Every structure is written in structure tokens, then in C-alpha cells.
Curated annotation (Swiss-Prot):
It is a lipid-anchor. GO terms for biological process: beta-lactam antibiotic catabolic process; response to antibiotic. Belongs to the class-A beta-lactamase family. Its EC number is 3.5.2.6. The gene is penP. One of its GO terms (cellular component) is plasma membrane. It catalyses: a beta-lactam + H2O = a substituted beta-amino acid. It is found in: Cell membrane. The class A beta-lactamase family has a specific amino-acid numbering system, sometimes called Ambler or ABL numbering and often misspelt as Amber. A multiple sequence alignment was used to derive a consensus sequence and then the consensus was numbered taking into account insertions and deletions. This allows use of identical numbers, e.g. for active site residues, despite differences in protein length. UniProt always uses natural numbering of residues, hence there appear to be differences in numbering between this entry and some papers. The chain holds residues 48 to 303 of 307 of the full protein. Large exopenicillinase is the primary secretion product; it can be converted to small exopenicillinase. This is Beta-lactamase. It comes from Bacillus licheniformis.
Amino acid sequence: DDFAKLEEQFDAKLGIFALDTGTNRTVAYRPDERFAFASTIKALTVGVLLQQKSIEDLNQRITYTRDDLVNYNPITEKHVDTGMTLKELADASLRYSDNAAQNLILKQIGGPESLKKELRKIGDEVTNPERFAPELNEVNPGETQDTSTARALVTSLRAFALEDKLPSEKRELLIDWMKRNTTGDALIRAGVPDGWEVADKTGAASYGTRNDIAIIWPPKGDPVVLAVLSSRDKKDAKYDDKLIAEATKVVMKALN
């Protein structure tokens, strides 16, 4: 009802899945409903890159041209003459949601098709990577390309960051980057109590899609993995971040 209330208030569709790793307690609402993943895919992409290379390989300097720049290149646009290391690219991608950075990384792993194979490998038969950025943001209802589910996103995020798809030191790199994200202050971070550390990755796409996936650490205890996906019934519809913050509060209460 609390979740229904939010859909009413914001005129949006909500997709939620939360798992308490400490008790295996779960919170779900439209858990298996498909939504464009948007930029949330950036986190899964780095997970794959990390698996593919050694910490040292990350120091490889990548040279690019103005031709590699897309619509949003906050960091990337400033280093076209010098090039950027894989490590630096991953930083740009996760912390600033740099689009060119995402594309550069994707190219390094073999493209969307390669990424897909790797996700399948980890046991994720839901996530559907197919395009580069920003076109991946263009999804119409019914379409399945560049989509996923709340349950699938948390399952996959958890695999790479908390489980055995990556060794400890690589897991650490990923978590640090995510913890220091600069784009999610008004989302999941806003619906969490004072003192709890958050690692998150946001996304925004067509049909007023607004997403946030994270891992939350209580003062003392095992982390909580959560996905909050949302969409609206109009192509040019805008989104309201308050939806995410409020939905988060409901989850905490439901788990607390």
C-alpha cells in the first residue's frame, strides 16, 4: 500500500527489490517488471572490466579522439590530447556518469555483445545490453533491449561487489568508486539514516525513467542491496528524484 501510495503521488510505475544479506529478509514490489536500466549498467560494465584485467593492467593509457565524445563527457572532454588510463575512465564512468567513458570501456571489452556474454557467464539471463551510450537510453514500452529487472540488477550487483565474481582487492576498487559517487545525493542517499554508508549508481532514460542501485552498510551489520527503478507513461515525461528518496524510506522501515 505504501508503495502503491507513491505511484499515486508521483504518477509513476515503481520497480523494487531489496535484500538484507544479514538475514535474507526481502522487500519486493514489481520485482520482475522490466525497465530500461539506463546508466546503472555502468557499474556492471566496470565489474566485467575488473574481472578481465589485473589491477596493474588498469594503468594502460587509452588514447581517443573528439570522435569518441558523445552528448555528456564531463571528464573525458578535458583529456582528449593526453588520453586516459582505464582506471581513470572507470572513475569518470561511475562517479560522473561520463558517457564517452562508458563507450571507451565497452570497446575495450568487446562491445555490448561481449558484455552480454559475460553477464550470462555470471548467471544473469535477464539483463539485455545491446547499445552504446546514449542511444541505450531510448527504450519504448514493450521493447526488451537495454532492459533489466530490479531482482536481476541487485543479484548481479551483489555478485560482483560482495560475492565471488571478483577477488577482494578488485571488489574494493568498485565499492570505493561507488561510495564516492557525485550524482546520487537526492536519491537512495536521501532516504537512508545518518551514519549509513552508501555505494550507488544512478541512471535516467526516456519515458521519465529514473533509477538507483546501491549497497547500504548499517553502522554495524551486513549490507543491504537495493534497486529502485521507475518510469512514466509519456516519452518526454520528466522525473522527480523525491520518488526514489521516499521509496527508500519505505524499504528501510519494511526491513527495520
